[PDB]
Design a protein around this ligand. Structure first.
Ligand code: NDP
Ligand code: GGL
Ligand code: AKG
Length: 417
């Protein structure tokens, strides 16, 4: 049923087919450099002891310490962790961070655990994987069903074990502001998406002031993308959507009022002055920027032709299928690859790690400007590769990331060819 690691390896081979890479380097990149599977025992609230399965996969560390989150899902598998670590490698390589690829996970349903049990689980996971993590070895991060509270617990346990012999704040990112946290973490993904959209408009020669944007999904990423677009880029937000449905208004939407209505009516539907539309119908609107910030695979071969957006900002994690990719490219529409558009979160986590390591913490403006520089440089590199190699933007981003990792490997002497 299309194993995640098989899919990742196929993606890597496809990317290697568009660039000059040696066979030994490809074989090295097809396998994670270190996989750690540990037992995570905790004491239940009823006094019993339960053992959970924890993972920590470090795909590659040629460019520096590995970076990646920890998932707490009942359906976690070592294959999924390996695939996500492989993808995290390219995610940190495309935006030029001194990081490798890493990922963790515990096979547990956190909906049935109390606060004390969750804290015990985090501390036991740290005790189990201490020997393969560190400020300069492996930096975990929040992921699905994991939050900054668990980050604080993990950091505290790591500091307790390490005996405060170094920057224990920098061992993990996504921490609360009170303990080594960073500013701008809430709006990192949306800010990166906005910078990439601005650069794409600059590349296409389109002035965004007075244009239209449609956003699918109105969670944290979608709402902040719409709000930041309207604020900075001056783009008129004409359509937003949630799981229940979507709304449309050619005169424009106010993101704050829409958020208030969603937080009051439980959904964005039936917003005053707005016409109710379906998600599929939102994908059909004639806009200049489309930002899918929702479930995977919303653009398929069926509806790829009927898309009228000039720029498709893949804020979510792969909302466009390869057939849809080819169809959309044929229509002369610029796509911003998913792991380049939403690279703001990992970039801001890197900024947090830098602040923790240095012992000096920045402000909201400094973080915003550094993120702006990083996203602009990454998008311009990807677009230049796209224009030079006459390939898809996703293929160009993969080529850039794999080339950076391959050059780092060659410089270390790991591969001689
Ligand atoms: N936000 C972040 O920090 C980062 C985000 N990403 C990626 O970004 C996207 C969104 O992130 P995030 O804000 O955390 O997500 P959220 O869980 O906070 O919100 C999800 C939003 O998308 C909607 N949604 C879920 N399924 C559908 C669907 N089938 N159709 C239409 N709308 C749907 C939800 O609707 P409803 O409210 O009704 O449930 C909600 O509006 C994801 O694809 C994620 O992978 C990854 C990098 C970090
Ligand atoms: N797993 C999250 C956290 C970022 C990080 O790995 O530092 C992401 O990929 O965005
Ligand atoms: O894995 C991540 O970094 C985020 C994934 C996510 O937010 C999602 O799947 O909804």
């Amino acid at each position: 049923e299309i194993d995640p690691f098989e899919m990742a390896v196929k993606q890597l081979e496809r990317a290697a087919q568009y660039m000059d890479i040696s066979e030994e380097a490809l074989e090295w990149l097809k396998k994670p450099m270190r996989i750690v599977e540990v037992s995570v025992p905790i004491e239940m609230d009823d006094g019993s002891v339960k053992v959970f399965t924890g993972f920590r996969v470090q795909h590659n560390w040629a460019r520096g310490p590995t970076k990646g989150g920890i998932r707490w899902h009942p359906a976690e598998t070592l294959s999924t962790v390996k695939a996500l670590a492989t993808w995290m490698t390219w995610k940190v390589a495309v935006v030029d961070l001194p990081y490798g690829g890493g990922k963790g996970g515990i096979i547990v349903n956190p909906k049935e655990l109390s606060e004390r049990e969750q804290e015990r689980l985090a501390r036991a996971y740290i005790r189990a994987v201490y020997d393969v993590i560190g400020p300069w070895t492996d930096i975990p991060a929040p992921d699905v069903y994991t939050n900054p509270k668990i980050m604080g617990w993990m950091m505290d346990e790591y500091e307790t074990i390490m005996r405060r012999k170094g920057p224990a704040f920098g061992v993990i990112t996504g921490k609360p502001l009170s303990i080594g946290g960073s500013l701008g973490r809430g709006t990192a993904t949306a800010q990166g998406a906005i910078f990439t959209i601005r650069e794409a408009a600059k590349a296409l020669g389109i002035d965004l002031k007075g244009k239209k944007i449609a956003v699918q999904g109105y969670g944290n990423a979608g709402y902040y993308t719409a709000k930041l677009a309207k604020e900075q880029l001056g783009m008129t937000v004409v359509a937003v959507s949630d799981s229940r449905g979507g709304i449309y208004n050619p005169d424009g939407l106010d993101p704050d009022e829409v958020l208030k209505w969603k937080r009051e009516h439980g959904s964005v539907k039936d917003f005053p002055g707005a016409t109710n539309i379906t998600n599929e119908e939102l994908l059909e609107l004639e806009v200049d920027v489309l930002a899918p910030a929702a479930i995977e695979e919303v653009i398929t071969e069926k509806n790829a032709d009927n898309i009228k957006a000039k720029i498709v900002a893949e804020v979510a994690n792969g909302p466009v299928t390869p057939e849809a990719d080819d169809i959309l490219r044929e229509k002369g529409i610029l796509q911003i690859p998913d792991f380049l558009c939403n690279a703001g979160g990992v970039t801001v986590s890197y900024f947090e790690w830098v602040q923790n390591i240095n012992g000096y913490y920045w402000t909201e403006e400094e973080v915003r400007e550094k993120l702006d520089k990083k996203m602009t440089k990454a998008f311009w590199e990807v677009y230049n590769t796209h224009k030079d190699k006459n390939i898809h933007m996703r293929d160009a981003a993969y080529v850039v990331a794999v080339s950076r990792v391959y050059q780092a490997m060659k410089d270390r002497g790991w591969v001689k060819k």
